[PDB]
């Protein structure tokens, strides 16, 4: 299972399943998109 790029909260990108991706420390993960906090 490759890391999910379009999903940080859930392990679902849209077409296939994926793993949880660890965003940067100064970044905040939202529903399905990581943005700077």
């Amino acid at each position: 299972l490759f890391e999910c790029s379009f999903s940080c909260e859930i392990e679902k990108e849209g077409d296939k399943p994926c793993k949880k991706k660890k965003c940067k420390g100064g970044w905040k993960c939202k529903f399905n998109m990581c943005v700077k906090v």
Side-chain angles (χ1 to χ4, degrees), residues 1-35:
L1 279 111
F2 233 89
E3 216 85 76
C4 227
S5 291
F6 208 76
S7 245
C8 181
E9 181 69 78
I10 304 112
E11 282 181 279
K12 245 166 168 243
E13 190 234 79
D15 188 276
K16 67 239 268 118
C18 49
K19 289 206 112 82
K20 231 201 286 177
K21 159 155 234 92
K22 267 288 223 282
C23 223
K24 266 284 196 217
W27 277 69
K28 182 85 146 119
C29 276
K30 221 166 117 164
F31 273 44
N32 293 107
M33 225 274 112
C34 193
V35 169

